[PDB]
Amino acid sequence: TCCFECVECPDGEYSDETDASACNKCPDDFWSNENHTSCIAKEIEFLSWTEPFGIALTLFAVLGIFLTAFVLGVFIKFRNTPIVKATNRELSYLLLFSLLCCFSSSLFFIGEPQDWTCRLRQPAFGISFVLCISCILVKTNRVLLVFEAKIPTSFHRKWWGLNLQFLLVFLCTFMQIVICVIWLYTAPPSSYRNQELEDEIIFITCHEGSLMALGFLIGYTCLLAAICFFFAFKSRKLPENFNEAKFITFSMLIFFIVWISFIPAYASTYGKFVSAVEVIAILAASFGLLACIFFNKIYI
Amino acid sequence: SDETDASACNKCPDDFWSNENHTSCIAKEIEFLSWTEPFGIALTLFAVLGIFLTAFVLGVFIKFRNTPIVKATNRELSYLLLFSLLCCFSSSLFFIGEPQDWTCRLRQPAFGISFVLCISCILVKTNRVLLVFENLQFLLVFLCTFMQIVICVIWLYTAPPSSYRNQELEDEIIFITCHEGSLMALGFLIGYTCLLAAICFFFAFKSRKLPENFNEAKFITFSMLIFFIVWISFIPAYASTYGKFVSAVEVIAILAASFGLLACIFFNKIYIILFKPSRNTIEE
Ligand SMILES: CCCCCCCC/C=C\CCCCCCCC(=O)OC[C@@H](COP(=O)(O)OCC[N+](C)(C)C)OC(=O)CCCCCCC/C=C/CCCCCCCC
Ligand SMILES: CC(C)CCC[C@@H](C)[C@H]1CC[C@H]2[C@@H]3CC=C4C[C@@H](O)CC[C@]4(C)[C@H]3CC[C@]12C
Ligand SMILES: C[C@@H](NCCCc1cccc(C(F)(F)F)c1)c1cccc2ccccc12
Ligand SMILES: C[C@@H](NCCCc1cccc(C(F)(F)F)c1)c1cccc2ccccc12
């Protein structure tokens, strides 16, 4: 026994005595040093505000808010010009508010995840986007109907006349407000500290809990997109001051392009870049919508 | 360790890992985008559909070839464009399977050459303001393709691509990938393929309002815009996919833009020739 050899301790075990005779296991929430001589605390990785990437996504999502505010100001100052009144000046306003809601949803992906944030992350963006899609769809059908008129109108009360314009949007949004409510009560999302995947790093993420709702939401938000194009296809022969086809088929194509190009990184990679690409995709879709439709007219 | 009373635990050879019970060594697992994975059948099926669609289109044009609509445009340039499009979808098929030595070399240049050829046809055709200064069209197309052919060759001499057999991503899993030789050649290839498309997109914007052949310039600028949007997005997707989905991202991007050039420029005229035979040297 007086004669022995020296062998290094394996990963995650340390020693601090002269003749160890055994490797002491590192305590929980700690990891061995480079030389296996003293345990050190692990590292927690999440999309924080200290790194410039976080400072960046935030400094975009303020520029978008400012641009949307500027656009709504023209439609409020020049609220009686023929081309502004050409597009629905009611439903055009409601859309702008929905776009404001859209830019904001992204700021719920920055910072340490918590229960309420993880629960409110997806439904807000889904509701806002479907609200915008419903606004576009109802506006388009009204003009086709106005311009498919054989014999004159018969609306019996002017005010209720504009009730249809607003209630159809709520009817469209009702299906996803339902799905969001039943989902949240029957299995709410919750936070989950994961340390199994990599030994030295603790990951803080959320947990979907029930995944079947995440398929129905995509199916619905997408089905509506298939309707925006068809109506966009049907609305190609109208005159210029009212035409809105090119814009519709480019915005939804951008949406599909981004959210189908970003599938594999989301499917494979784990960690902080998933949230990064989600934020960048949301921002890309929202700008795409805003400048496809409202900017030509804001130039004119 | 195998037997009883082991003084020390033997390491395992580099081509193996160790069983859950640490008793003995088993074989490592090699991962790569295969032809049987459920996520590659969709890509194979999608492509085959594109190939069949291109074959059908070249059918109608070389069958109803004695009509004013097809003769209004140049037939030779249409054949060249259809041939280039047929090679893009087929090229994508070169991005799926076990990476061999020669495949890594033929991955990029084939698509680059095909896309340069297809873009060059549209350029020689945008409202003839380009062609007014000044058969000549074939010479210009050959000159456009030759600079990409040359850059490919100097590159294959000075650094060919080959397999890597990476072992630094997953200790248990062996990754088979391609090492893309040098970066200057790839950067120059991308720069040229984008610079040509930029010029094509501009003159056509410029000539977007001329209603020649059912306003074909507008569809060309639509296709160019689609191509940019698709590839500006390729940046973050690939920059954050780590594993065996880089090939998937590349295939998805290539398939999108190929359909982008085929559909825009062809489907309106395909509909006109096949149905409603009422336009003959009047609306053409
Ligand atoms: C890496 C990411 C990849 C993601 C995949 C994306 C693939 C999509 C890209 C490309 C393939 C097809 C693209 C074709 C684009 C159409 C161009 C366009 O903009 O159209 C022009 C409009 C406007 O015409 P105008 O009013 O100015 O002229 C009026 C003149 N006068 C009065 C004579 C009539 O005319 C019209 O017909 C408008 C009718 C709307 C056209 C429908 C768009 C077809 C989309 C097909 C695929 C979409 C789903 C993708 C699959 C993934 C599912 C998740
Ligand atoms: C893969 C396929 C199905 C994607 C969709 C392609 C087809 C359906 C789309 C893409 C571009 C579209 C065309 C865009 C512009 C015009 C000009 C207009 O005066 C007639 C309709 C027409 C000709 C559209 C017909 C439908 C069209 C050809
Ligand atoms: C933001 C997203 N929730 C995470 C989906 C991750 C994903 C990553 C990459 C691709 C895809 C998708 F394209 F397959 F959806 C999903 C979301 C929530 C709610 C509604 C949505 C409607 C449209 C798009 C996204 C929606
Ligand atoms: C298929 C595609 N090459 C993708 C790999 C790019 C890359 C992969 C890995 C590293 C680097 C980097 F080194 F440049 F960053 C770049 C391609 C091929 C040919 C022409 C093309 C023209 C336009 C767009 C894409 C083209």
Strand partners, A192: A205
Cα–Cα distance measured from residue B72 to residue B216, given in angstroms and rounded to the nearest whole number: 12
Q: Which ligand is nearest to the CA of A280?
A: 3
What is the structure's resolution, reported in angstroms to one decimal?
3.6
Residue type, A142: R
* Beta-carbon-side half-sphere exposure of residue B251 (alpha carbons within 13 Å): 25
Interface contact flag, A261 B243, Cβ < 8 Å:
no
- Do the Cβ atoms of B223 and B265 come closer than 8 Å? yes
Crossing angle between the packed helical segments A91-105 and A273-299, to the nearest 10 degrees: 150
Q: Which residues of A touch B (CB under 8 A)?
A: 7, 250, 253-254, 257-258, 260-262, 264-265, 267-269, 273-274, 276-277, 280, 284
Q: Which residues contact B233 (CB under 8 A, 6 or more apart)?
A: A257, A258, A261, A262, A284
Report the length, in residues, of chain A.
300
Cα–Cα distance measured from residue A177 to residue A218, given in angstroms and rounded to the nearest whole number: 14
**What b/e string do you get for A224-247 counting C-beta neighbours within 10 Å, with b at 16 or more?**
bbebbeebbeebeebeeeeebbeb
Q: Are strands B178-179 and B162-163 parallel, antiparallel or unpaired?
A: antiparallel
- Do the Cβ atoms of A251 and A294 come closer than 8 Å? no
Instruction: Calculate how far, in angstroms, residue B101's C-alpha sits from the geometric centre of ligand 4.
Output: 19
Element containing residue B19 per DSSP (H, E): none
CB pairs under 8 A between A and B: 51
Q: Which atom of ligand 1 is nearest to the CA of B249?
A: 1
Give which of A287, A293, A248 is closest to A92, Cα–Cα: A293
Instruction: Calculate how far, in angstroms, residue B237's C-alpha sits from the geometric centre of ligand 1.
Output: 23
Searching chain B, which residue's CA lies closest to the CA of residue A272?
A: B240
Cα–Cα distance measured from residue A270 to residue A266, given in angstroms and rounded to the nearest whole number: 8
Mutation pick for ligand 3 pocket among A118, A120, A122 (CB with most ligand atoms within 8 Å): A122
Residues of B in contact with A273 (CB under 8 A): 240
Cα–Cα distance measured from residue B279 to residue B284, given in angstroms and rounded to the nearest whole number: 7
Technique that determined the structure:
cryo-EM
Q: Residue B237 is nearest to which of A254, A262, A274, comparing CB atoms? A: A262
Tokens encoding A256: 């599909």
Q: Which residues contact A296 (CB under 8 A, 6 or more apart)?
A: A247
